[PDB]
Every structure is written in C-alpha cells, then in structure tokens.
C-alpha cells in the first residue's frame, strides 16, 4: 500500500457513505481513517480519506458521484492507489472557506440557514478527513442537501504550549469553517461563520 497498488473504481455502496465524502474500501485492503493518493495519470492525483464497508470487493475502491465528477473517475476504470501521510505540523486546517448552494434546484427555498450550526455539523461529520482546494462534495444539513466547493485553506497555528495557504489539508477538531453562497444563489445564510 505504501508503494501503491492497482485498483478498480467502483460505485459507493450506501447513501450514508455517499454523504461521508470518504472513498470506500474493503477491510481486506485497508483500515478506516487512512488517507491515500489516487493517481489517474502523471498529472492527476487526488487525496481521499478511507472508510471500510463489508460490501466492497477487494481490489476496488468505491466513489460517490460528486467524487467521480471532481477527480474525473469512471466506474470500472483502473487507478493506482498509495497510502498518504499528512505532516500534521504543517497540514492541519486552521481555516477553510467553502462556497455553498442548494444541490437540487427543486428544493430551493428562502428560509434562513444558521452558519454557526452548519459549521459545527460540518466539523462533526468530516473531522480527520482530507480536503483540497477546488474539491466538490455534498453536505447534508438538517435533511437538506447542499453542494460545497472548497475555495481556500489555511494551516493552523501551533498550540499555546508552543497564515500559510495550502492546497490540501486535514480537517481537525479545532478547524474553523466559513461559508459563502455561490453567485446568484438564493440561499439565505445567517450567523457568524460566513464570508
């Protein structure tokens, strides 16, 4: 796994896993929580955090539609996957800016959405996972689906006992998230976790 191995891209097994933004794998190949770099070509590499599920066939990695559309993956294609280790002294996320909008135009409404509650739920759901600038994913908040786009990521400060922009980082328990609606969005955001 450290050297990297060939795998086949598959479809995400459950709706719940689809919302986790994790790449899903067999317990026979990896352990949940590990991170990997997925290679589709010399110029295209993407970092994902893994979660196991009993239904995944060994030798394959399952991705959700949003992940497939961001990394440019096709079901059934061959990919190379290698274990990735973050340098936590430099890559833990201090602040991240995320563009948000309703995922389904059918379900758009003018009601207020509390960004402070959204930011808290975001951390509760994605802590200890990799995010890259430009990455697209879906976020379920209060039974409503939203589309997210990572616009910016800044590394965290050292602890008290002891701002750089980064392309990829690890969301941790004390990371801060700020939301901004997409241009021409009718999304009504309230609260202080904005901009």
């Amino acid at each position: 796994n450290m050297a990297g191995r060939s795998m086949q891209a598959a479809r995400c097994p459950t709706d719940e896993l689809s919302l986790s933004n994790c790449a899903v794998v067999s317990e026979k190949d990896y352990q949940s929580g590990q991170h990997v770099i997925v290679r589709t070509s010399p110029n295209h590499k993407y970092i994902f955090t893994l979660r196991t599920h009993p239904s995944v066939v060994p030798g394959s990695v399952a991705f959700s539609l949003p992940q497939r559309k961001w990394a440019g993956l096709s079901i059934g294609q061959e990919i190379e996957v290698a274990l990735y280790s973050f340098d936590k002294a430099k890559q833990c996320i201090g602040t991240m800016t995320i563009e948000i909008d309703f995922l389904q135009k059918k379900n758009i409404d003018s009601n207020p959405y509390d960004t402070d509650k959204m930011a808290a739920e975001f951390i509760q759901q994605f802590n200890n996972q990799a995010f890259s600038v430009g990455q697209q994913l879906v976020f379920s908040f209060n039974d409503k689906l939203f589309g997210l786009l990572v616009k910016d990521i800044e590394a965290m400060d050292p602890s008290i006992l002891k701002r750089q922009k980064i392309e990829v980082g690890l969301v941790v328990g004390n990371s801060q998230v700020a939301f901004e609606k997409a241009e021409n969005s009718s999304l009504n955001l309230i609260g202080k976790a904005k901009t």
Side-chain angles (χ1 to χ4, degrees), residues 20-22 35 49 93 125-131 169-171:
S20 74
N21 196 224
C22 286
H35 311 285
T49 295
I93 296 172
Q125 164 131 61
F126 305 120
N127 66 88
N128 213 14
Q129 291 186 28
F131 283 85
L170 184 73
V171 168

Side-chain angles (χ1 to χ4, degrees), residues 90-101:
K90 299 201 183 171
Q91 302 180 90
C92 288
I93 296 172
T95 309
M96 178 165 41
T97 299
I98 297 172
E99 181 181 299
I100 180 170
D101 201 350

Side-chain angles (χ1 to χ4, degrees), residues 90-97 123 152-157 163-164 166 169-172 174-178:
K90 299 201 183 171
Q91 302 180 90
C92 288
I93 296 172
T95 309
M96 178 165 41
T97 299
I123 296 302
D152 185 77
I153 306 171
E154 283 179 33
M156 309 216 292
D157 302 305
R163 326 184 190 177
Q164 175 183 310
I166 51 183
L170 184 73
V171 168
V172 291
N174 53 7
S175 295
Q176 290 170 282
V177 169

Side-chain angles (χ1 to χ4, degrees), residues 26-191:
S26 162
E27 307 184 341
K28 293 179 182 297
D29 297 320
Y30 310 90
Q31 301 201 336
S32 302
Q34 289 183 301
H35 311 285
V36 299
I37 185 142
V38 172
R39 172 185 186 294
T40 54
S41 98
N43 282 348
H44 305 269
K45 309 288 207 305
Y46 306 84
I47 297 171
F48 297 85
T49 295
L50 310 177
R51 179 61 188 272
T52 58
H53 188 271
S55 76
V56 179
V57 187
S60 72
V61 180
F63 304 87
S64 67
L65 175 61
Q67 297 173 322
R68 277 183 248 130
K69 304 169 85 176
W70 167 61
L73 302 174
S74 293
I75 293 172
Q77 98 171 66
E78 177 168 46
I79 52 169
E80 273 182 54
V81 186
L83 288 175
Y84 179 86
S85 275
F86 283 94
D87 171 351
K88 292 190 178 177
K90 299 201 183 171
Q91 302 180 90
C92 288
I93 296 172
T95 309
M96 178 165 41
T97 299
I98 297 172
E99 181 181 299
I100 180 170
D101 201 350
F102 290 99
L103 183 74
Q104 307 172 293
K105 28 197 57 183
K106 298 304 186 190
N107 316 312
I108 293 177
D109 68 54
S110 65
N111 295 312
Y113 290 86
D114 197 320
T115 60
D116 297 310
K117 293 169 184 167
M118 288 180 35
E121 195 171 318
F122 184 93
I123 296 302
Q124 191 70 35
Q125 164 131 61
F126 305 120
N127 66 88
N128 213 14
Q129 291 186 28
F131 283 85
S132 294
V133 173
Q135 184 164 9
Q136 302 149 32
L137 68 149
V138 298
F139 175 46
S140 179
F141 176 68
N142 267 297
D143 295 300
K144 201 85 173 186
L145 296 181
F146 298 85
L148 307 183
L149 165 63
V150 182
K151 303 298 298 185
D152 185 77
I153 306 171
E154 283 179 33
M156 309 216 292
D157 302 305
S159 65
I160 199 66
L161 296 187
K162 292 178 197 145
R163 326 184 190 177
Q164 175 183 310
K165 292 181 183 178
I166 51 183
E167 299 156 58
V168 52
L170 184 73
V171 168
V172 291
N174 53 7
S175 295
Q176 290 170 282
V177 169
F179 296 93
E180 64 178 59
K181 72 174 182 180
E183 282 304 308
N184 312 316
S185 170
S186 69
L187 185 57
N188 181 196
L189 297 182
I190 64 169

